[PDB]
């Protein structure tokens, strides 16, 4: 996963033995990570076709 | 009665809209038909504090603990 415990959750070892990992686990699953304001669009090549999400 | 849940016959009781001003709120409330109340905004009042005022000489504003 990423090198960021503000988007990906911390794993179990550091979760059970840290402090900030338990904080980021708890608020990451309750509140949800914040996402900056803006409008985006992207598309992948799904096997049907140009699968877009906006 | 089967689970102790809260069944409600209220479709609109879980809508909450976020606006930017009071005039657009009033305009939308009259536009979309229903009645409305305006609980006016009450901002925090500015005050004046200083640590040098916390350690005065004859004035009684004194923290007496730190």
């Amino acid at each position: 996963k990423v090198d960021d415990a503000k988007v990906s959750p911390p794993k179990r070892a550091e979760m059970k033995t840290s402090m900030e990992s338990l904080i980021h686990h708890f608020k990451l699953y309750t509140e949800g990570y914040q996402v900056p304001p803006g409008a985006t669009y992207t598309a992948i090549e799904a096997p049907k076709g140009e699968f877009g999400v906006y | 009665p089967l689970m102790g849940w809260a069944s409600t016959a209220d479709p609109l009781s879980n809508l909450v809209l976020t606006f930017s001003t009071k005039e657009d709120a009033i305009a939308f409330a009259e536009k979309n038909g229903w009645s409305y109340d305006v609980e006016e905004r009450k901002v925090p009042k500015p005050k004046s504090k200083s640590y040098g005022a916390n350690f005065s000489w004859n004035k009684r504003t004194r923290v007496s603990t730190k």
Binding site: F26, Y29, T30 | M3, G4, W5
Partner: protein, 59 residues
């Protein structure tokens, strides 16, 4: 790593492992979890009611 039965666990030679910390009701994406919590005669925090809708559970 299958997802089936929805069991609960408990401590070795001990009482229940839950705390009613309500994280699972906050993260249940159909909100099938329902937790009502009280502490008992000890003082340690516990529950009263812990419900899963197996209909709404999407596993």
């Amino acid at each position: 790593r299958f997802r089936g039965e929805h069991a609960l666990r408990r401590y070795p030679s001990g009482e229940e492992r839950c705390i009613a910390c309500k994280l699972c009701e906050a993260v249940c994406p159909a909100q099938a979890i329902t937790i009502e919590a009280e502490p008992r005669a000890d003082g340690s925090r516990r529950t009263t009611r812990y419900d899963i809708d197996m209909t709404k559970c999407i596993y």
